[PDB]
Paper text:
In addition to the anti-TNF activity attributed to the N-terminal four cysteine-rich domains (CRDs) homologous to host TNF receptors, CrmB and [name] have anti-chemokine activity attributed to a unique C-terminal extension (∼160 aa), named as the [name] domain (smallpox virus-encoded chemokine receptor). Biochemical analysis revealed that the [name] domain binds a subset of human and mouse CC, CXC and C chemokines, including CCL28, CCL25, CCL20, CXCL12, CXCL13, CXCL14, and XCL1. The identification of other poxvirus genes encoding homologues with the [name] domain indicates that the [name] domain represents a new family of viral CKBPs, which has specific folding to allow its binding with chemokines, either independently or fused with vTNFRs. Here we report the crystal structures of the [name] domain of [name] encoded by an ECTV strain and the complex of it with chemokine CX3CL1.
The crystal structure of the [name] domain (residues S162−D320) was determined at a resolution of 1.57 Å by using single-wavelength anomalous dispersion (SAD) method with a Br-soaked derivative. There are two [name] domains (molecules A and B) in the asymmetric unit, related by a non-symmetrical two-fold axis with an r.m.s.d. of 0.62 Å for all Cα atoms. Although these two monomers bind each other tightly with a buried surface of ∼1160 Å2, the size exclusion chromatography revealed that it is monomeric in solution. Therefore, the [name] dimer in the asymmetric unit is caused by molecular packing and unlikely has any functional significance. The [name] domain monomer adopts a β-sandwich fold, consisting of two parallel β-sheets and the connecting loops. The β-sheet I consists of five anti-parallel strands 1, 5, 6, 10 and 11. The β-sheet II consists of six strands, which can be further divided into two segments (antiparallel strands 2, 3, 4 and 7; antiparallel strands 8 and 9). The β-sheet II outside surface is completely exposed to solvent, whereas the solvent accessibility of β-sheet I outside surface is limited by a long C-terminal loop after strand 11 surrounding the bottom half of β-sheet I. A disulfide bond, C180−C317, further fixes the conformation of this extended loop by connecting it to the 1–2 loop. However, there are several significant differences in the arrangement of certain secondary structure elements, making the [name] [name] domain more compact than vCCI and A41 and also directly affecting its binding with chemokines.
Author numbering: 161 to 320
């Protein structure tokens, strides 16, 4: 079976802004006035439906996730691209994941532009909800020490 769920998490320190704006679509964004996170998902069948950005002091957890009812088309190759853009970032660079052996087909790239973050963690997680929890593919990236964001709720950007 193929994954029917994609979870993207981005944890960041330090952040100075709590207010954000979201626009989901082919190129989904979460942005504050100091950081923009841009996600693409070409040829990935599960559709991204929600996101969040929530802060405790200067620590942020954020992410995008899909509906979990439709399985990936095994005839198309899911490509997840993610870019974290700092306000005055001058040059892009690629992050390298901590593992490269996976159970399911997918490709991903994670890029950061600027050095405004002392800690940046990214997880791209593909799961077949029909399969045991330990069979998920977890693609993990860390620029520094790994942030603990346990128990920070997934508040969305809408202030209405």
């Amino acid at each position: 079976g193929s994954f029917n769920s994609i979870d993207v998490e981005i944890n960041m320190y330090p952040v100075n802004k709590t207010s954000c704006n979201s626009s989901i679509g082919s190129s989904s964004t979460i942005s504050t006035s100091e950081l923009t996170i841009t996600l693409t998902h070409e040829d990935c069948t599960p559709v991204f439906i929600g996101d969040y950005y929530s802060v405790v002091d200067k620590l942020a957890t954020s992410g995008f996730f899909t509906n979990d009812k439709v399985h990936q088309d095994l005839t198309t190759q899911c490509k997840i691209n993610l870019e974290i853009k700092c306000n005055s970032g001058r040059e892009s660079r690629q992050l390298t994941p901590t593992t490269k052996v996976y159970l399911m087909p997918h490709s991903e790239t994670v890029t950061v532009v600027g050095d405004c973050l002392s800690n940046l963690d990214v997880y791209i997680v593909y799961a077949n909800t029909d399969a045991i929890y330990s069979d998920m593919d977890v693609v993990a990236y860390h620029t520094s020490y790994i942030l603990n964001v346990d128990h920070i709720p997934p508040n969305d950007c809408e202030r209405d």
